Amino acid sequence: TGELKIECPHTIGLGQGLVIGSVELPPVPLTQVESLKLESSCNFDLHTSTSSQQPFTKWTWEMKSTSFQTKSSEINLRGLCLVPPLVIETAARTRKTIACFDLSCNQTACQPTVFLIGPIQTCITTKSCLLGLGDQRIQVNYEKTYCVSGQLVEGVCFNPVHTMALSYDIVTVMVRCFLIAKKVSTGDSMKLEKSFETLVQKTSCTGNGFQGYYICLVGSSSEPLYIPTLDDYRSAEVLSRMAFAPHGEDAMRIIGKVTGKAPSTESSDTIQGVAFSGNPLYTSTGVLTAKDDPVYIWAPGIIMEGNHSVCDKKTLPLTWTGFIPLPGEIE
Ligand SMILES: *[C@@H]1O[C@H](CO)[C@@H](O[C@@H]2O[C@H](CO)[C@@H](O[C@@H]3O[C@H](CO)[C@@H](O)[C@H](O[C@H]4O[C@H](CO)[C@@H](O)[C@H](O)[C@@H]4O)[C@@H]3O)[C@H](O)[C@H]2NC(C)=O)[C@H](O)[C@H]1NC(C)=O
Ligand SMILES: *[C@@H]1O[C@H](CO)[C@@H](O[C@@H]2O[C@H](CO)[C@@H](O)[C@H](O)[C@H]2NC(C)=O)[C@H](O)[C@H]1NC(C)=O
Numbered sequence: 001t002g003e004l005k006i007e008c009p010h011t012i013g014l015g016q017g018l019v020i021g022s023v024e025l026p027p028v029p030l031t032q033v034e035s036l037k038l039e040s041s042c043n044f045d046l047h048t049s050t051s052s053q054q055p056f057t058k059w060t061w062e063m064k065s066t067s068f069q070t071k072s073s074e075i076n077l078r079g080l081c082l083v084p085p086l087v088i089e090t091a092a093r094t095r096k097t098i099a100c101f102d103l104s105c106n107q108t109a110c111q112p113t114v115f116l117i118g119p120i121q122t123c124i125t126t127k128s129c130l131l132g133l134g135d136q137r138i139q140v141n142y143e144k145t146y147c148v149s150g151q152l153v154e155g156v157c158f159n160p161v162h163t164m165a166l167s168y169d170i171v172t173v174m175v176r177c178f179l180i181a182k183k184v185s186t187g188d189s190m191k192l193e194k195s196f197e198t199l200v201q202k203t204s205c206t207g208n209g210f211q212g213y214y215i216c217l218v219g220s221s222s223e224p225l226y227i228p229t230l231d232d233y234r235s236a237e238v239l240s241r242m243a244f245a246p247h248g249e250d251a252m253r254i255i256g257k258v259t260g261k262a263p264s265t266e267s268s269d270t271i272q273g274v275a276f277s278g279n280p281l282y283t284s285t286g287v288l289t290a291k292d293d294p295v296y297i298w299a300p301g302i303i304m305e306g307n308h309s310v311c312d313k314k315t316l317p318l319t320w321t322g323f324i325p326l327p328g329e330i331e
Contacts, residue, residue, distance in 0.1 A: 004131070004139065009151070018118060018224065019119075021220070023113070029110075035134065036101070037051070037078065037133075038050075056075055057072050061301055066257075079133075081102050083215070088180075096118070099115070099116050100114075103284050104283045105298075105299075109280070115176070123142050148331070149331060153219065158326075158328055159328050160326045171326055171330070174218075174321065176217050178215050179286075180212050180213050190211040192214075194208060195239065199308070200308045214320065215227070234324065237325070246306030252279055259273075272314075273304040276301060283319060284298060288315055
C-alpha cells in the first residue's frame, strides 16, 4: 500500500482553492502499463475525462551492432494526466475530483506517479479512502494541518503574500503543473514554447507551434495558477525554473543520443533524446513543440529533448514538479 497524503486547511475560505497530493508507486513491467486503470472507493465525484482512451506515439530503443535501434508506433493509453481545458480551473465550482497518473519508465519498467486534485470540501467528508492502480493499493490520508493560517512547508508554518500590488519572509514551496492542449484560431497567444524561447534564446526558431498552457497548484493547496500569466511573479518563477530544469526538480546510466519518428508515420525524424538504462528518474511523457495539434509521446528508456535553447525535435513534459521561493510571513 502506497500513501497519498492530503494536507487539509482549517477553513475553506474564499471558495476557489483545491487540495492536491501525489505519490510515486513501485515499478510495473511495460506490458502491464497499457492495462492500468485507476479505481476509487473514495466518496468524491471523479471527473471521467482522464480514464478515456488517448493516442500516444510509443518510442523505444534497443541495443544494436550508431549502437541504437529506435522504433515507434501509435497506441492508446488510458488514465494519464491529459486534463482538458477548464477542468482543473473550475473544479472548485463543479466539485469534481481529478485523479490521473504520469509514467516514469526505463526500457522494461514504469513507475506510475498518481496525482489527486480536488475540492477542499473533501477534507470535511473524508479521513481516508482507497485508490487502486493495477495490483497496487493506495491509501489516501486526509490530515489536518499543524498551522493556524498557512501550510507546513519544510517543517515551518507559512502564509504567502495575498495583495495584487507590490509592497517579508521567504519560503520555498512545491509546484505541480499539468500540460493542457488549447488552440485559438488566430495569433500566437497560446504558443507556449515561444514563451520559453524568449526567456532562454539568442536567435529566432522557425517552427514551434504547439498551443497550450500549464495549470499548476502551489503547495498542498491553492487556487489554480495559469502559466503563463505575464504580469504574475509566480508564473515568471515557474517558467524560469522550467527553463533551467525542463524535466522537473528533486543510479541512472546515460548511453547516448537517439532520434525517432513521431508520429511513426513520419518519413523523417521529428524527435530526439538521450537513451538511458537503470532506474527511471524523470517522467517519460510529453508533447512535440513543433505541432499545433498535439503529438503525444511516451518514450520509455529515453529522456526526450526538453532543452528550450534547441530549436528542433524538442518536447514539453505532460507534468512538471518543482520548487519556487514565495514571499510571505512565517508566523
Ligand atoms: C528498469 O528499472 C527496474 C526497477 O528499477 C529494474 O528492474 C529491477 O532490477 C533489480 C536489480 O537489477 C531487480 O532486483 C532483483 O530482485 C530480486 C527479488 O528477490 C532479488 O532476489 C535479486 O537479487 C539478486 O541479484 C543481485 C544482482 O546484483 C545481487 O546483489 C543479489 O545478492 C541477488 O543475487 C535482484 O536484485 C528487480 O527484481 C527488478 N525490478 C523489476 C520491477 O523487474 C530494471 O533493471 C531496469 N531496466 C533496465 C533495462 O535498466
Ligand atoms: C541546451 O542547448 C544549447 C544549444 O544546443 C546548448 O548550448 C551549447 O553548449 C555548448 C557546451 O555547453 C557550448 O559550447 C555552445 O557554444 C552552446 N551553444 C549555444 C548555441 O548556446 C546547451 O549546452 C544545452 N544545454 C544542456 C545540454 O544542458
